[PDB]
């Protein structure tokens, strides 16, 4: 956080928060509440943040290989697809239709019930429907030997989602 | 404090004696021995250290699984430390001071007699 002028506190990659005098050039726009900023070796000086961002390790996508499953199986109903059509592509990118009716669409999707499998079929099937960046990580993927890197990884994962 | 005056005033000889043994960090366990001079030792820093021992300690006093001192510069063995153990668990285990003498018995003879000769006798 930015505590006052000419100086601010920055957590080190090792996890220890450092209180450092900021550089006199840019004190404001690239500061941001939470960001990854480069520091000097000995002095840990605040100079420049990321663009943002360089993102993080691991990877994304990989679901574009094709083919998986065609959505035409439920195409005969049209009672099921109408609720799906409103819950998939319109929540993806649409703007003026929301503020009008005033309903705020939720981001929540929770899948329970296996067996059977389901799931990833409709995942790569959405890849046929629409094209977007898919972040795929196991729940244990961010478990490491230190607890200082953990909060940064899940932050770097969710900060590219809003970006 | 008057008891704390001379108590705190003893740091002049302390800092003189603080320079030796200052490097004893940390307690380290050894592993095996291929030859007499050199032994492999492991420390709580997770880093294992092969080293020889100083001329002040005989090699025969180093046994497998013995925590010994160290000189962080030279890594050599300094002084052995007998306790390897244990974190906590002692304070409830250790019992001291007496109470409840033999005069509190309620008249049982043969019972308390044959269990007295198993330990006290």
């Amino acid at each position: 956080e930015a505590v006052d002028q000419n100086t601010a506190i920055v957590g080190s990659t090792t996890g220890s928060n450092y209180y450092v005098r900021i550089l006199s050039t840019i004190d404001r726009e690239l500061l941001k509440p939470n960001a990854s900023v480069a520091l000097h070796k000995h002095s840990n000086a605040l100079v420049d943040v990321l663009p943002p961002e360089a993102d993080s390790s691991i990877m994304m996508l990989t679901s574009d290989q094709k083919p998986d499953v065609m959505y035409a199986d439920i195409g005969g109903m049209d009672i099921q697809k109408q609720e799906v059509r409103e819950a998939v592509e319109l929540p993806l990118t649409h703007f003026e239709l929301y503020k009008q009716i005033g309903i705020d669409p939720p981001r929540g999707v929770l899948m329970y019930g296996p067996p059977g499998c389901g799931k990833t079929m409709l995942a790569k099937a959405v890849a046929h429907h629409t094209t977007a960046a898919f972040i795929r990580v196991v729940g244990s993927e961010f478990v490491q030997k230190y607890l200082g890197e953990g909060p940064r990884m899940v932050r770097d994962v969710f900060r590219l989602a809003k970006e | 404090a008057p008891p704390a005056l001379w108590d705190l005033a003893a740091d002049k000889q302390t800092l003189q004696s603080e320079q030796p043994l200052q490097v004893a960090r940390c307690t380290k366990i050894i592993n095996a021995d291929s030859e007499d001079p050199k032994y492999i030792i492991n420390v709580k820093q997770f880093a294992k250290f092969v080293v020889d021992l100083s001329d002040q300690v005989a090699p025969t006093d180093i046994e497998e699984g013995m925590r010994v001192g160290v000189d962080r510069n030279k890594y050599q063995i300094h002084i052995p430390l007998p306790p390897k153990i244990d974190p906590t668990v002692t304070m409830m285990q250790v019992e001291e001071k007496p109470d409840v003498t033999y005069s509190d018995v309620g008249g049982c003879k043969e019972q308390i007699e044959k269990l007295r000769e198993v330990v006290e006798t």
């Binding site: 663009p51 993102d55 990877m59 196991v138 478990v143 | -």
Partner: protein, 353 residues
């Protein structure tokens, strides 16, 4: 003569301090690269002029300088334990088909495991996929390990052996990346084969929720599935797991996919007892005129080593008789006695389906 001074000049090269390895992430610009050491700190540092374009990479392990932290030369990897998994060997071919049973189970992993390497075209032309996993449980008899074990090195000199002792690791066990490391070097061998033995320990069930040790068991399972769920070699690699009873698999591993094939063992038959006999003869020999049917018939439903023990137990009675061979009358004595003693210990052969 002068080769000693050459080694002395090599000691002058030994005076150079070793650099520190690291994992790159990405790049902000050509002058700013983001590297992360194995210890976990990240460093944005400059680079020197001697490197090449192959240094950049999409997050490949590199070494960092001890001062500028610049990358000199990238080392691919390092592994201490790998060599201990390189040395596993099993015979057959013949010694696999000599186990005497079950006859169709020898005909199973023959074409399932060994065949994909010699004739991969047979599966891809017809369009049928080979199984990516199998499960061998027991012990209704023997052969849970051997059935998959002999075909393991029969595919090629390629094999990688996994012991359940390496999964538990230590407090805050880092073997999560070692399960990735062990499978990473399992892909160094092609086509790869994966074993898992005695999963009734490391296969901890989440039915009744226990201490977090059951959770880290699932995390080690996540490291198993992830790399085998690729995005990488999948149909080419054959994974094998083994258990005492398959109630520990949970609905995930009980399902096919991860654990596909389930195979048990049955008992031999008459006149087939003479078949499995010939391969159990081996080193132990006996009198010229004999009939082995009395030997093996008295022991029914026994391990192949148990019958092998009966042959040695009858052979260790020979040294008490100070003769090389023994008549079959004293044989049946030592055969029947020891065999009936094993049957009282045969309890708990009932296994859940």
């Amino acid at each position: 003569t002068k080769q000693y001074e050459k080694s002395e000049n090599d000691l002058k090269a030994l005076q150079s301090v070793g650099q520190i390895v690291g994992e790159v992430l990405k790049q902000l610009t050509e002058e700013k690269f983001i590297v992360k050491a194995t210890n976990g700190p990240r460093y944005v540092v400059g680079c020197r002029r001697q490197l090449d374009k192959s240094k950049l990479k999409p997050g490949t392990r590199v070494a960092l300088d001890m001062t500028t932290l610049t990358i000199m030369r990238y080392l691919p990897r390092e592994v201490d334990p790998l060599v201990y998994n390189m040395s596993h060997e099993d015979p057959g071919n013949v010694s696999y088909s000599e186990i005497g049973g079950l006859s169709e189970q020898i005909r199973e992993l023959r074409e399932v495991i060994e065949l994909p390497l010699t004739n991969p075209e047979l599966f891809q032309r017809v369009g049928i996929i080979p199984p990516k996993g199998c499960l061998l449980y027991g012990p209704p008899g023997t052969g849970k390990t051997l059935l998959a074990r002999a075909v393991a090195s029969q595919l090629d000199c390629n094999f990688l052996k996994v012991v359940s002792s390496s999964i538990v690791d230590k407090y805050i066990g880092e073997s999560a990346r070692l399960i990735r490391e062990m499978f990473n070097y399992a892909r160094d061998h092609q086509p790869c084969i994966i074993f898992m033995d005695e999963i009734d320990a490391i296969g901890g069930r989440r039915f009744s929720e226990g201490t977090s040790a059951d959770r880290e068991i699932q995390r080690t399972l996540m490291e198993l599935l992830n790399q085998m769920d690729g995005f990488d070699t999948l149909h080419r690699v054959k994974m094998i797991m083994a258990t005492n009873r398959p109630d520990t698999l949970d609905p995930a591993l009980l399902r096919p996919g991860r654990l596909d094939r389930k195979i048990h063992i049955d008992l031999p038959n008459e006149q087939a007892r003479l078949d499995i006999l010939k391969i159990h003869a081996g080193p132990i020999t006996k009198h010229g005129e004999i009939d082995y049917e009395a030997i093996v018939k008295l022991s029914d439903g026994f391990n192949g080593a148990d019958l092998r023990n009966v042959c040695t137990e009858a052979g260790m009675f020979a040294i008490r008789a100070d003769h090389d061979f023994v008549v079959q009358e004293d044989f049946m004595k030592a055969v029947r006695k020891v065999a009936d003693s094993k049957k009282l210990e045969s309890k708990l052969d009932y296994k859940p389906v």
